[PDB]
């Protein structure tokens with residue numbers, strides 16, 4: 120895709136309306152959200168969707184109930200807003216306690232147990248006594264375990280729709296919700312001769328330890344540019360996460376802007392910067408959406424998102440490369456790290472004209488210079 124195509128919001132039809140989608144936004148042609156949309160029925164007056172994506176799963180409630188939506192992805196909020204669907208930039212556990220009659224939760228299984236658990240408790244807390252929860256997911260991705268936990272948290276739960284491995288259950292709040300679990304974790308790491316303490320919420324990439332790929336990029340970077348080759352330079356970190364690249368580069372004296380689509384990750388980076396006596400801009404952004412048209416940089420780094428066992432480069436990751444080329448000043452440099460067999464080489468050749476391979480072992484570090 121072009122950058123314009125990556126950022127474009129496109130309305131798709133459904134009976135009675137339309138819904139905007141875009142590359143990089145969750146919840147479109149997803150069997151879990153699809154099964155929800157076929158299942159959810161109004162109950163009471165006030166509903167909360169704790170994982171809406173583009174908003175298909177709880178869309179049947181719109182216009183029949185007041186529906187609030189809490190969403191962590193910037194890309195997904197751009198879509199919801201375009202669709203005229205009330206939505207807040209919010210973590211699931213930021214939900215108002217006891218203020219809803221119905222909650223909708225597509226299980227965010229890909230973000231892991233801690234994130235799901237926090238979401239389950241947020242759902243239980245959000246509901247008034249006697250409120251109900253639609254819980255949807257995948258038996259191949261923990262549905263039975265999470266449904267068992269939901270039933271323990273709330274009361275009577277039963278599966279109300281089945282399609283292959285995909286399930287929707289309906290549950291009733293019959294008991295008092297517990298307090299939220301402890302959410303913050305911290306760990307320390309030594310990077311390029313300096314100590315960092317990272318802080319993060321649940322669901323972030325590489326919780327609890329620095330990704331070896333990120334370490335490899337930083338090693339390649341320092342070898343190429345020298346210990347001082349970053350001081351006073353403007354750096355963009357595409358997909359900054361809790362700051363594995365961001366913090367060291369700030370420590371090295373760079374003026375760093377991190378862009379990150381996930382709110383939990385943005386807040387994690389902010390806490391880490393504070394904890395380490397470091398300054399950087401930690402932007403909640405779908406790729407470079409948050410930047411001015413004019414912003415350019417001297418150095419751009421990225422450890423892009425990837426599909427678990429995938430052989431194809433994600434749309435977001437392709438956009439990262441296109442954006443890096445576009446956002447670099449002449450003489451600027453780009454560093455990217457990935458699995459050795461992802462086909463980034465042709466992309467860098469097309470966008471920069473040439474590239475170099477600085478490292479290839481467990482991961483590869485590719486490099487390009489803006490001409």
Ligand SMILES: C[S@@+](CC[C@H](N)C(=O)[O-])C[C@H]1O[C@@H](n2cnc3c(N)ncnc32)[C@H](O)[C@@H]1O
Nearest residue numbers: 324333358359360363379380405406422423424
């Ligand atoms: C492989 S992780 C790398 C995180 C961090 N830079 C590190 O090295 O540990 C990729 C990051 O890209 C972020 N991401 C995914 N889609 C994005 C998007 N559309 N815009 C910006 N960041 C995105 C993810 O949330 C994740 O934090």
